[PDB]
């Protein structure tokens, strides 16, 4: 197979991989394409998401024209390091991995016209600024921006191979999302102005929507049951101070525990999430369910219970058996309709 | 490109990277400007902050001066291994890496007069010792020391390229917990045992946001403290109620501190949040000793009682309100 060996020797002979194609002659145009093999999990604490893609780059290098038996040279990824390749980096990438098990996951195909296809398998951790103000009923547009690190807009321009909506493809089976739903993605192009010049930036915004099922099970239901549990004491006779005292005290203790552990899923943001308001209102109900008993006990003249003169049923108790369940139900309708 | 290929070949022909520019002569003036991408996470547990930036360096190497071509040659980042670069390092840095996807994040931009623009995209985890005495109402001052390792001030000079405008992107930073009040650029020489070295310091004065801590620890501390006062409205003969109410609030105050001590390093001094929790625990403990005092009087000293209750129904809410006013005015 020395015929193909001569071609590779001929191509790399007098080849300077330190200069982009058309240096000082034209703008090097790079056509890109992304295939998302798996959209990895989203981390709220680090405000980052993981993506696993086939990052395909296509461009024409006239220094790599050949005539041979085969029109396309499906070469080895070792050949890539001997050829000028674009220095694409991700602007919001935190810590990315270019996999090389068991070999560098790269392909390089040189058609006889000089076109190069250069795809790699990358795992990218990207910064996704999250406005956790409607948490957990919130949605984010996690971006993915990339462009040439060194070459300005006048030297290297990026472009989408197919139509922009069709040049980023998500595999149906690959979705490593636990508590999110990938609604879709919008593909766009922009411009950034740094201290070193203009740079074309290719962006892709993935539109995630958090699934509320987990937080309903683990946070909203315990808060709702605690409010209902605290209102059970409204049906107990006023001459049972120890029993109703334990009812109010334990529920307030329970609410404090829930109010603390509910933040463990989030970064320490300075505002209040939509879940914080629900906990605050539940805290207000449970706290007031004990102040209500602290008022009935204040008017409990006798200590012995019914089986002389006996205590009458509290008028505060009768109203609290209705107003407290009713207001909480009214609050639930307002709270859920506001965010859903 | 045939002419450009010849020109770049001549620059690296006979080029010795073991010797700095003007090796036997005046020090090379290296100008530095930083484009901060983000400040990732400030940790009191590890006493460090993570910083991502577009660190750039500037210097004129006459050996890399090319004429004829009117362009600024941006070369592939693999050429940096064949050029002299300053041995810049970060003194307080713990763990740093230059990103390497899709390639190594470097740029070499030669200019015809001989200037070299050398940019790196670096993520640095730098040490930042903190004074948590006024935590969480504290301002921290985390710096970034930049220094040359091998070359003394006789062989290299560091200056901020552009003066006070040499660091950008600080305004775009939005830390969830802190707030960058300001930043300063300092240029000074540091003397070690092997000579005096140039140093640049970039310092941030982070200010903590109290909003999170109010919803996390301050408010439950207050409500539990308010909760303990409910025993002041219960008949003294209700032993099973007032004791259970009083004891429970005592436990929770200790319990609340558990969910807070684990989030911070084992510092040996008292924080401003510990002062409040110790203050709240005193009231809750005294609100329980108030009942034990009443129960002993009515039973162990029977053979006024309601006076102590009514007196405590005003003094405790008043003293705790006064306690907050003294605490908050001093710390804010």
């Amino acid at each position: 197979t020395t015929v193909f060996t001569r071609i590779l020797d001929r191509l790399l002979d007098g080849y300077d991989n330190r200069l982009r194609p058309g240096l000082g002659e034209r703008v090097t145009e790079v056509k890109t394409d992304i295939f998302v093999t798996s959209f990895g999990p989203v981390s709220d604490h680090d405000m980052e998401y993981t993506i696993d893609v086939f990052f395909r780059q296509s461009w024409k290098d006239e220094r790599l024209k050949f005539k041979g038996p085969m029109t396309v040279l499906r070469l080895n990824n070792l050949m890539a390091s001997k050829i000028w390749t674009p220095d694409t980096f991700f602007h919001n990438g935190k810590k990315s991995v270019a996999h090389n098990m068991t070999m560098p996951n790269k392909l390089l195909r040189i058609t006889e016209d000089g076109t190069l296809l250069y795809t790699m398998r990358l795992t990218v951790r990207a910064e996704c600024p999250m406005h956790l103000e409607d948490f957990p009923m919130d949605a984010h547009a996690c971006p993915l921006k990339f462009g040439s690190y060194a070459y300005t807009r006048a030297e290297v321009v990026y472009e989408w191979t197919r139509e922009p909506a069709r040049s980023v493809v998500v595999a149906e089976d690959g979705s490593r999302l636990n508590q999110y739903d990938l609604l879709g993605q919008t593909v766009d192009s922009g411009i950034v102005q740094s201290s070193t010049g203009e740079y074309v930036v290719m962006t892709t915004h993935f539109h995630l929507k958090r699934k509320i099922g987990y937080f309903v099970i683990q946070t909203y239901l315990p808060c709702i049951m605690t409010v209902i549990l605290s209102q059970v004491s409204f049906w107990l006779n006023r001459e049972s101070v120890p029993a109703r005292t334990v009812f109010g005290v334990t529920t307030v203790l329970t609410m404090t525990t829930l109010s603390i552990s509910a933040r463990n899923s989030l970064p320490k943001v300075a505002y209040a999430t939509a879940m914080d308001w629900f906990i605050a209102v539940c805290y207000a109900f449970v706290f007031s369910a004990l102040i209500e008993f602290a008022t009935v006990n204040y008017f409990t003249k006798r200590g012995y219970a019914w089986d002389k003169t006996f205590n009458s049923v509290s008028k505060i108790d009768r109203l609290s058996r209705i107003a407290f369940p009713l207001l909480f139900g009214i609050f639930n309708l307002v709270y859920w309709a506001t965010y859903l | 490109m045939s002419f450009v290929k010849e020109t770049v070949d001549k620059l690296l022909k006979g080029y010795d990277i073991r010797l700095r520019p003007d090796f036997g002569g005046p020090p090379v003036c290296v100008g530095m400007n930083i484009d901060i991408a983000s400040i990732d996470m400030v940790s009191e547990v590890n006493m460090d902050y993570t910083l991502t930036m577009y660190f750039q360096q500037y210097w004129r190497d006459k050996r890399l001066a090319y004429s004829g071509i009117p362009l600024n040659l941006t070369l592939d980042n693999r050429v940096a291994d064949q050029l002299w670069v300053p041995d810049t390092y970060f003194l307080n840095d713990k763990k740093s890496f230059v990103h390497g996807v899709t390639v190594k994040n470097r740029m070499i931009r030669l200019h015809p007069d001989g200037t070299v623009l050398y940019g790196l995209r670096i993520t640095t985890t730098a040490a930042c010792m903190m004074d948590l005495r006024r935590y969480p109402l504290d301002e921290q001052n985390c710096t970034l020391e930049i220094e040359s390792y091998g070359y003394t001030t006789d062989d290299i000079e560091f200056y901020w390229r552009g003066g006070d405008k040499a660091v950008t992107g600080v305004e775009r930073i939005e830390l969830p917990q802190f707030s960058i009040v300001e930043h300063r650029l300092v240029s000074r020489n540091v003397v070690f045992a092997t000579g005096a070295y140039p140093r640049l310091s970039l310092s941030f004065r982070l200010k903590r946001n109290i909003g999170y801590f109010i919803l996390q620890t301050y408010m439950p501390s207050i409500l539990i403290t308010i909760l303990s006062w409910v025993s002041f409205w219960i008949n003294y003969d209700a032993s099973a109620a007032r004791v259970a109410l009083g004891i429970t609030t005592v436990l929770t105050m200790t319990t609340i501190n558990t969910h807070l001590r684990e989030t911070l390093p084992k510092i040996p001094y008292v924080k401003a949040i510990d002062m409040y929790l110790m203050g709240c625990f005193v009231f809750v403990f005294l609100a329980l000793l108030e009942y034990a005092f009443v129960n002993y009087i009515f039973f162990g000293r029977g053979p006024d009682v309601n006076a102590i209750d009514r007196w405590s129904r005003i003094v405790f809410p008043f003293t705790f309100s006064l306690f907050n006013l003294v605490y908050w005015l001093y710390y804010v």
Partner: nanobody
Amino acid sequence: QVQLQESGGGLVQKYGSLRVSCAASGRTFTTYIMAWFRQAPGKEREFLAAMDQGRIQYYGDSVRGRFTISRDYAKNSVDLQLDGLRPEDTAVYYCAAGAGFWGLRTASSYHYWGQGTQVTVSS
């Protein structure tokens, strides 16, 4: 209450240049996307420009190379440098700021909107 007050100009000679401005108030939009929209009479809102937190500028096709957007993050404001104006540019220009969900080009993805500075070009 969040306010997006827009200043600039209302009348300009054909061939001139104008610099519309928009100062935010009540909230920092450092992490949001600030954009410019225009609505000619008897027509829908047309996306013009937008700059993200990473200083990345997105321009509409009809205004690419003419209108330049530039934010001042310290002052919490966004400024559009109108250039090469034509009589077809006579419209109400709006200042918008939002997260950018499903959008960055959709008027429905911006939560906070400005008042609307009328701009007129006469030949």
